[PDB]
Amino acid sequence: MPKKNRIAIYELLFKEGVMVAKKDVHMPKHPELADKNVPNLHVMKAMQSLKSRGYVKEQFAWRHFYWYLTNEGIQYLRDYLHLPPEIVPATLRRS
Amino acid sequence: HQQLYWSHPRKFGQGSRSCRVCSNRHGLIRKYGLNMCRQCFRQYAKDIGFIKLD
Amino acid sequence: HRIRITLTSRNVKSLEKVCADLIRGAKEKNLKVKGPVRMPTKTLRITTRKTPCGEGSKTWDRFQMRIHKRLIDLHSPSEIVKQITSISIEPGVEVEVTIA
Amino acid sequence: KKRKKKSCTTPKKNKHKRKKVKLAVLKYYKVDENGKISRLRRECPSDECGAGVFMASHFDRHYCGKCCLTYC
Amino acid sequence: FTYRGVDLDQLLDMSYEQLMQLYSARQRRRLNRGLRRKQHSLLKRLRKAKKEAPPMEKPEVVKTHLRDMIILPEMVGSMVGVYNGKTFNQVEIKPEMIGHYLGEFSITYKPVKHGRPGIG
Amino acid sequence: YKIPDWFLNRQKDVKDGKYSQVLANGLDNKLREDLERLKKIRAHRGLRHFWGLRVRGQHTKTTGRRGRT
Amino acid sequence: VQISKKRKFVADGIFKAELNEFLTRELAEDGYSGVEVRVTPTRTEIIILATRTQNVLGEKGRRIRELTAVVQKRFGFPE
RNA sequence: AGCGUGUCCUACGCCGGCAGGCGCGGGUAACCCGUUGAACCCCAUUCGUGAUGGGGAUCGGGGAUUGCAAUUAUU
RNA sequence: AGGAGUGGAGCCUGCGGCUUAAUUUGACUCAACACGGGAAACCUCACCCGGCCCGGACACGGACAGGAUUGACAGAUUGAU
Ligand SMILES: [Zn+2]
Ligand SMILES: [Zn+2]
């Protein structure tokens, strides 16, 4: 998994608090990650890794994975991407 | 290997269609574009809007 | 100038209530209307084997869905058109408007 | 059916182990005591990796690993 | 030998896009659709083994999985091992075979000799 | 006499490629050659004709049990 | 270029069947009891009936703001 | 005739014996195929009790389509 | 009381058997046998003969940026670019 692909996947999940994928390992491009050439397999196997550490919670239904960031995920991706502490996911900014 | 990993054609036949719920390849209902298998349609028929009248 | 309103539903009671409300409102204002014409009912049929394994006495489920259609014609400006439709809202009814 | 365990094949295939070459950067540049350098490897005229990527000095061809371009 | 009144001497000189008037409909249609990379790679291998052989001696076997291959006149004289599913069987191209497929000449099943009837 | 070519019983012959209608004594003299071609050139269908089994890819499990003892 | 009405009335029930299944596996331990879809031309509303209303939106409403963003990605709604 | 399907269902014109091919058109359908010119039925002809022109199995040559691939014959 | 029949023939399709490298498998009176939407060229596919890939998360230990690893032209080899 190229480091550019890994960074692209991680900093897209950060803007929201959610991620969606289809259980299709032969799909050549993830629709949310077009023009970056990130396959659908890489997203699946990256969210598999982030779940095992406890930073995200998943839900599966009808060929679809729905992942959510946990409080330990914002704390962990803020140091991985060296983001300013003045960055918060779109889920955390309303109401 | 990249040339030949998923390189058999999958344009037609049962090996190119599957259930939209359970991904099974046997007993699929293509009519109206249901795309649900024989046994998953009996489970969600009322939710879709099908009624047993006669 | 001609305004065609197409209604389509699966519950004929609700659909007829909506159509009657629209016709009555158009009569209430100063409009000329062409009455509700009923297109033939659409009957969709799925027949399935009841069993999941092909063992028993070969019984079949007969499933079906029914779609009801209407058409209404008006001769009025769109400003006048877009009040009565917004008043009456009902679930399951697919209201469509076409200007000539 | 019933499992029948036939594992016999022409022995066993061996996966290619790469060779650990130490300081491969040395052989690309020849440095004397006067400071001037000589480039011992012929270089590929391309855009993806030009200006820094050397080709393969084989016995009959020159070959760029990244470009897969071969001059005979 | 001759095919439709045309012998091998000119058959080897007949243009590939011109053989389609001597074959039957099926093989004319296949030649019209086109030969692919696996077919060309097998033709090239059969050519090499034919040229790199003693003149008065048969060539070396070129084994292939391609049972659906038209037997062209350029194949005449080749020594070909056709895969039947388990083992490669040796098949030599005789002239009168210039029409059929390859897999026809390597049977994929054992002829049945029946034994003692059992339960039924 | 202006009879179209698609009307005969051997149209594009294998050995000479001529459109001819074969008749009573010749019609059976050009079938044995057809089978001998595929028996000498060991085609699958020529071996089927040789063993006496069926030719056009049929189901021999149930039908065809005449001649066989 | 639009779709036939035979296929449109069907596709509106396949969409509502999967949404109920997704919400069933998500909010069951919070009293999930049904969903209702109101297709307003400007804004598609989805009403979720449940017992524990506090465990559906959650503190600061940080949970129903996650659902409304994970649903539109799945079903291709505009933002 | 009636029940049904259709973004693959197809009208119209030209070359073909045909299976079938080329150019324009319509239809997301009580709008187009389609006023769905269906088959038995019905009216004239030939045949004339016979393994017969009944009945079509089996097999040999050609031709055309679907498909990446039809040889253990796809149709 | 009767009508059309099936059981006889040719063939199409399922079950045993017998073969086979494999001829994948469930179901055996009514309550198995044109049933598993089961009309399988490839896929389907489980079965047979071979050959690539890991798509083995995560935790710990080792080695390693004086490089952990990654992919690749040509000759050979291979059914195969
Ligand atoms: Zn299913
Ligand atoms: Zn280069």
Automatic annotation (TrEMBL), chain D:
Zn(2+) 1 binds at C44, C49, C64, C67. In the N-terminal section; belongs to the ubiquitin family. It comes from Homo sapiens (Human). This is Ubiquitin-ribosomal protein eS31 fusion protein. Zn(2+) 2 binds at C49, C67. It is found in: Cytoplasm. It comes from the Eukaryota. The lineage of its organism: Eukaryota, Metazoa, Chordata, Craniata, Vertebrata. Component of the 40S subunit of the ribosome. Part of the small subunit (SSU) processome, first precursor of the small eukaryotic ribosomal subunit. During the assembly of the SSU processome in the nucleolus, many ribosome biogenesis factors, an RNA chaperone and ribosomal proteins associate with the nascent pre-rRNA and work in concert to generate RNA folding, modifications, rearrangements and cleavage as well as targeted degradation of pre-ribosomal RNA by the RNA exosome. The chain holds residues 78 to 149 of 156 of the full protein. Part of the 40S ribosomal subunit. Part of the small subunit (SSU) processome, composed of more than 70 proteins and the RNA chaperone small nucleolar RNA (snoRNA) U3.
